[PDB]
Ligand binder design. Structure first.
Ligand SMILES: Nc1ncnc2c1ncn2[C@@H]1O[C@H](COP(=O)(O)OP(=O)(O)O)[C@@H](O)[C@H]1O
Ligand SMILES: [Mg+2]
Lengths: 811, 131, 131
């Protein structure tokens, strides 16, 4: 449902740039002239709609247009809009006829939305805004990613003659990699439920399709087998996505030039630990718990003492069932996949023993024992506790002491005491979370030990599947980390666009002094610079006795004045603050920041786990340092991960897939314009258009220019005496363009967009005596085209007409 | 099956039945023949059919592949914004222009029966007439 | 004496998506598909909301029954008419033709036999045959 906060932010993104040319030199309205506007009862009444199409009426005035809405259908009523509420319209263009948004005459917001929409309603869900690929979730199987479409995009001689697709990106990336021996990274971003993980798997399947076999099938099978396993352990049903990834995924892959994955390496970061302890309503925990409890056979349930999905504290008893999701069939696939990852049957039984032990431990109840206030395991549940630790291959007595016995330092003396109930529950809970997270990461380390190359990667295909910018009502620490990640990726995007444009200008002799670059250096620094940043002061406060959320906030406001990018909050300034992210201000709540940042199992508990006699459980925490140090802080560990990850990505040629969720109802063919526009903005699709249009954005070879612009000055263009490069100079000099509107390169004519549009009108003016001939030829062919489309559906029509005449008899 | 024979006998003359009467029967039996079906049996047997050929004709007219999805194709083709609706005028022009065109009055009567509103869920219109 | 009403009617609903009214831009294409050309004055004189009956009457009055595609090639004028095929395609592209390359192949399918130099009288004749 469209929130009034969503209408508010969507209307801030809305801008009006170019002027509407509704009048001729006479001052009369062009007969039938069409515009977009955001003023319409249709728009007040339907929150899915932000603009409507109207005809300007004979008699309007330049300062106040009189218009009548035509699409969606209206009343015929004239009404008046200020020109700043009218937008040019691409009235006669077929949106299916080309793949990039920037080929439209007008790329204002209502025009962009309408172009994507009509493509999408025809199931063409992929569109470019170079270098971006836009992918709109169709919420149905379109049939466009089968093996037959892989083979089509792979084996077609000229793939640029196919429509945009994620396979176009997979092919062009693999081709460059093998073409110039350069690593590549495909970066897939977007909000929850937009389609990033599906896109990722589609691309993976393309890369796994070899023209003539893969001798390393064993390793490819393990890599592909990991998708259901990573989804089971790391994905959960939320309100926005029945299959929400609750981690970011980075992969490296080695792929033969004809297809087939030969090596790989997987990385998961930012796992939502809290999900395993509690879940909002209508939401589940990680799929694996439900797969396991419903899918385990009677011998495994009896062995582990398993109860039903509705009988575990850690599992929301009311959301256990997800429509369209068969957890039993999913479990069978997970068990098959673990085998394909070269885990033995014994290995797999340990894995699910640990899973059953975490669940069982969650069901152990504690009580307040007062004789100071101490905690104890309810005597009724002591056996449940012991079975939980047995299932985890953990020492039951030592695990007990760590949850119940406290050691405090007062003065400079160690004083044994007792955790109270609340604290002991936190400790029991943190053991559950830590065991689950380390088991996930252990499964990945096992996978990597089977698929990685011995000596590291020479050249590799990267793939990142991560949350895009997130702006929620309550933004917390998890959102901060996500939005820092996306500032790093934004920079990767603006840098590669600049690098590539600068290189082309230089290779062609054109001056780069006119090139623009929108740095986000200041905001990255305010977030990450050592000593002078939010992450620096979150760390300091964590490492300080008597640190507080509010002191963290306070220390930030006082020390980060020298840049606008930090802004204290007007409302509740004590525990809230605002960052000026590239996509706009985002408000975070520091409440619990220090808590969440310290939520890492440390200390003697980790040493009890490492002492397990079971080899897998010993490895869960392998090599962890004994202990509060910053090496145990989520924010400090996260920034190390991020920096390492971006150094790797920045060493590659990036590709950007930007996924869009078109409505919040998981439905096909439903288009919510305010939600989509908000995503156009947060994905930098509108910005990518701007960036590309700037400067001398039109380039063509001398003979391309001449094939395109012969009739600007047909004389100069058909002079055999003068050379091609010199013909272009002649034509351009005689055209009337200002010197500022074009430059001649080594091999190309550079034009500003405005310059190319003028030259197009100039050529048409020189051809005015063909206007009527071409108009009639065109219209007559279009009528033929429209009739052929009808003829396809006539057999169907006969069936409708036939049944009508049947019902007539039956009456 | 006896309905088959009974209806034939009401329309038979000299053991043979005219194609127009065979199509009328076939509709009484709940089949929906079209000019394509009538052209098929004309190519084989001319304009008057023996009982055996009348049964063969009823075979041609079964059209099991008929379903809401196959019938709506032409209406969906003109539904550019994908609303699922067309006005009555749109569906009237379609039914009265192409194919085994209905007369204007036949098209109106069929639309006005199914609904009294100008905009018609054409998926439901086709489901209604498929019964 | 040759009645075009049926052709005029079909064409209208092809360009209007089967509605009894048509947008001004689509009306220009419709009339252009029958060789009809209006001055900017005659254009401004038109109704703002053109319906079927309006178009059927305008078409009778404006269609050139003797020379439907006069504005491609006029037989009254002694044009002796023959221009280069790639220039033709250039002019079409200069004037922002909505014809896709497939359509331009459609155009060349209808009007070209052999890869010759294209004759506009051939164009006009071929389109006249396809009305
Ligand atoms: N290309 C697609 N084609 C068909 N269905 C899709 C497609 N992409 C996503 N979906 C549907 O949307 C759901 C969520 O997509 P997902 O990739 O998990 O989103 P994200 O990973 O961005 O959070 C999928 O489970 C699927 O139902
Ligand atoms: Mg995902």
């Amino acid at each position: 449902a469209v929130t009034n906060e969503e209408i508010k932010t969507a209307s801030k993104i809305v801008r009006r740039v170019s002027n509407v040319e509704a009048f001729d030199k006479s001052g009369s309205v062009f007969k039938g002239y069409q515009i977009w506007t955001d003023i319409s009862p249709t728009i007040e009444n339907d929150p899915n709609i932000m603009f409507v199409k109207c005809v300007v009426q004979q008699g309007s005035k330049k300062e106040k247009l009189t218009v009548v809405q035509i699409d969606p259908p209206g009343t015929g009523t004239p009404y008046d809009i200020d020109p700043t509420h009218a937008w040019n319209c691409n009235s006669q263009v077929d949106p299916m006829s080309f793949g990039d948004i920037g080929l439209l005459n007008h790329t204002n917001i209502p025009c962009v939305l309408d172009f994507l929409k009509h493509r999408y309603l025809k199931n063409q869900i992929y569109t470019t805004a170079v270098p971006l690929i836009v992918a709109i979730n169709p919420y149905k199987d379109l049939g466009n990613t089968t093996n037959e479409w892989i083979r089509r995009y792979r084996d077609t001689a000229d793939h640029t003659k196919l429509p945009p697709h994620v396979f176009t990106c997979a092919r062009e990336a693999l081709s460059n990699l093998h073409g110039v021996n350069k690593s590549q990274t495909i970066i897939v971003s977007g909000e929850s439920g937009a389609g990033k993980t599906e896109a990722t798997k589609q691309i993976m399947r393309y890369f796994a399709s070899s023209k003539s076999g893969n001798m390393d099938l064993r390793i490819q099978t393990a890599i592909m087998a990991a998708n259901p396993v990573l989804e089971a352990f790391g994905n959960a049903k939320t309100i926005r996505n029945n299959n929400s990834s609750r981690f970011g995924r980075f992969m490296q892959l080695v792929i033969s030039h004809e297809g087939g994955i030969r090596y790989g390496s997987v990385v998961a970061f930012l796992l939502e630990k809290s999900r395993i302890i509690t879940q909002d309503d209508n939401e589940r925990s990680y799929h694996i718990f439900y797969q396991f409890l419903k899918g385990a056979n009677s011998t495994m349930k009896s062995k582990f003492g398993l109860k039903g999905v509705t009988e575990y504290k850690l599992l929301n008893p009311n959301s256990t069932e997800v429509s369209g999701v068969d957890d039993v069939k999913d479990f069978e696939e997970v068990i098959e996949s673990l085998k394909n990852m070269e885990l033995s049957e014994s290995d797999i039984e340990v894995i699910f023993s640990i899973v059953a032990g975490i669940l069982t431990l969650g069901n152990v109840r504690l009580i307040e024992k007062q004789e100071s206030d101490a905690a104890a395991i309810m005597d009724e549940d002591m056996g449940v506790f012991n079975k939980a630790c047995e299932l985890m291959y953990l020492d039951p007595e030592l695990i007990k002491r760590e949850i119940l016995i406290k050691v405090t330092v007062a003065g400079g003396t160690k004083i044994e005491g007792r955790w109270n109930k609340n604290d002991a529950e936190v400790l029991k809970s943190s053991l559950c979370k830590a065991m689950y997270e380390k088991l996930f990461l252990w499964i990945i380390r096992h996978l990597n030990s089977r698929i990685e190359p011995e000596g590291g990667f020479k050249t590799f295909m990267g793939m990142l599947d991560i949350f895009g910018f997130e702006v929620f009502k309550n933004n917390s620490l998890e959102q901060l980390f996500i939005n820092i990640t996306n500032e790093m990726l934004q920079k990767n995007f603006v840098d590669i666009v600049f690098e590539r444009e600068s290189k082309l200008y230089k290779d062609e002799g054109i001056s780069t002094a006119e090139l623009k670059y929108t740095s986000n250096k200041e905001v990255i620094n305010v977030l990450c610079e050592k000593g002078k940043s939010v992450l620096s002061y979150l760390e300091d406060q964590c490492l300080a006795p008597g640190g507080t959320d509010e002191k963290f906030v306070s220390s930030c406001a006082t020390n980060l004045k020298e840049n606008n990018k930090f802004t204290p909050a007007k409302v509740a300034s004590n525990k809230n603050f605002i960052i000026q992210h590239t996509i706009g201000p985002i408000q975070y709540c520091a409440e619990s920041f220090l808590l969440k940042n310290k939520d890492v199992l440390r200390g003697d508990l980790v040493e009890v786990i490492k002492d397990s006699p079971n080899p897998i459980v010993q490895q869960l925490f392998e090599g962890q340092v004994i202990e509060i140090a910053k090496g145990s802080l989520i924010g400090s560990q996260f920034l190390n991960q991020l920096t390492s990850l971006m150094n790797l990505i920045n060493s590659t040629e990036p590709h950007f897939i930007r996924c869009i969720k078109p409505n919040e109802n998981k439905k096909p063919l439903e288009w919510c314009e305010p939600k989509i526009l908000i995503q156009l903005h947060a994905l930098s699709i509108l910005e990518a258009l701007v960036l590309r249009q700037l400067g001398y954005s039109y380039r063509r070879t001398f003979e391309e220019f001449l094939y395109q612009y012969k009739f600007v000055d047909i004389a100069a263009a058909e002079d055999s005496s003068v050379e091609n490069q010199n013909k272009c100079v002649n034509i351009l000099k005689l055209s009337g363009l200002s010197e500022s509107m074009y430059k001649i390169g080594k091999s190309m004519v550079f034009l500003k967009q405005e310059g190319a549009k003028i030259l197009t009108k100039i050529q048409r003016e020189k051809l005015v005596e063909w206007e009527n001939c071409v108009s009639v030829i065109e219209a007559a062919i279009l009528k033929h085209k429209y009739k052929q489309k009808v003829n396809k559906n006539i057999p169907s029509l006969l069936r409708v007409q036939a049944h009508i005449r049947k019902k007539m008899v039956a009456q | 099956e006896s309905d088959v024979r009974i209806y034939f006998n009401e329309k038979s003359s000299g053991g043979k039945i005219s194609i127009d009467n065979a199509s009328y029967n076939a509709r009484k039996l709940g089949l929906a023949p079209s000019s394509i079906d009538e052209k098929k049996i004309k190519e084989l047997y001319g304009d008057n059919l023996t009982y055996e050929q009348y049964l063969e004709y009823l075979s041609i007219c079964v059209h099991d592949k008929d379903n809401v999805e196959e019938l709506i194709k032409m209406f969906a083709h003109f539904d550019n914004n994908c609303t699922g609706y067309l006005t009555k005028s749109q569906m009237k022009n379609i039914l009265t222009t192409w194919g085994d065109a209905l007369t204007d009055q036949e098209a109106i009567d069929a639309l006005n029966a199914f609904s009294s509103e100008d905009n018609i869920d054409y998926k439901l219109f086709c489901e209604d007439i498929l019964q | 004496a040759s009645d075009m009403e049926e052709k005029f009617r079909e064409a209208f609903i092809l360009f209007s998506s089967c509605s009894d009214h048509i947008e001004m831009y689509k009306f220009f294409e419709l009339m252009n598909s029958f060789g009809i050309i209006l001055t900017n004055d005659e254009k401004a004189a038109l109704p703002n909301d053109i319906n079927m009956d309006y178009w059927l009457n305008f078409a009778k009055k404006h269609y050139n029954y003797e020379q439907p595609f006069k504005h491609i090639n006029n037989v009254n004028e002694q044009n002796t008419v023959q221009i280069k095929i790639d220039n033709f395609l250039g002019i079409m592209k200069a004037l922002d033709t909505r014809l896709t390359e497939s359509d331009l192949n459609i155009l060349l399918q209808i009007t070209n036999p052999e890869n010759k130099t294209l004759n506009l009288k051939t164009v006009s004749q071929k389109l006249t045959e396809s009305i």
